[PDB]
Amino acid sequence: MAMEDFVRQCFNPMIVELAEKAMKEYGEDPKIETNKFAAICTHLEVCFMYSDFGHRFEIIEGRDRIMAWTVVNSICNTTGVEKPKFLPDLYDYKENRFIEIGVTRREVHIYYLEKANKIKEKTHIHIFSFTGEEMATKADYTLDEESRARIKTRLFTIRQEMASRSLWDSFRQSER
Ligand SMILES: Cc1cc(-c2noc(=O)[nH]2)ccc1-c1cc(=O)c(O)c(C(=O)O)[nH]1
Numbered sequence: 001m002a003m004e005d006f007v008r009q010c011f012n013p014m015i016v017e018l019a020e021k022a023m024k025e026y027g028e029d030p031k032i033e034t035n036k037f038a039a040i041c042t043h044l045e046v047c048f049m050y051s052d053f054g055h056r057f058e059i060i061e062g063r064d065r066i067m068a069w070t071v072v073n074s075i076c077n078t079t080g081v082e083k084p085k086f087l088p089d090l091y092d093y094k095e096n097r098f099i100e101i102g103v104t105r106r107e108v109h110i111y112y113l114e115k116a117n118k119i120k121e122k123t124h125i126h127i128f129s130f131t132g133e134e135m136a137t138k139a140d141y142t143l144d145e146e147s148r149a150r151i152k153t154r155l156f157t158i159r160q161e162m163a164s165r166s167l168w169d170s171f172r173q174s175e176r
Pocket residue numbers: 035036037039040043061087088089101102103174175
């Protein structure tokens with residue numbers, strides 16, 4: 001699979017390994033579910049990028065479940081903020097709120113409703129597309145123009161890379 005080769009070549013090994021771990025532990029093979037693998041990596045990278053543009057953010061996504069919940073509990077105990085039912089992706093120490101990060105091959109409003117419906121919580125939601133569109137709750141985009149622009153550019157580059165290798169048509173039809 002070119003798709004597996006693309007993944008190993010466009011994401012850095014820590015991300016690839018983190019994505020592989022999370023698939024394999026749940027009995028999913030990244031050489032078979034190659035679109036899912038590419039999606040997990042993409043989303044991981046966005047979460048890491050989002051975190052890196054701030055010690056403003058706590059990274060929750062990408063840790064094992066014990067650690068993610070340890071981090072969430074520890075944030076809750078010290079800030080007082082409500083404990084989410086689902087593991088979010090980051091915590092924002094400036095805005096004092098969790099963030100759910102969405103990356104979608106579909107329209108941002110569509111994916112946004114899917115997320116908000118799933119955590120109907122007082123978690124902030126920020127959706128990115130592979131087209132440069134974003135949507136965030138209350139149109140509050142958390143980051144500055146430049147950090148958002150780097151995320152959008154990276155996502156658009158992944159898409160175009162996939163398109164170079166004729167993987168994009170498959171990739172975008174494999175989301176809900
Ligand atoms: C990135 C991803 C991909 C899939 C997926 N399954 O088949 C695919 O093509 N993608 C399912 C869930 C998730 C996912 C998305 C999120 O935004 C997210 O916060 C999580 C999470 O588990 O915390 N998982």
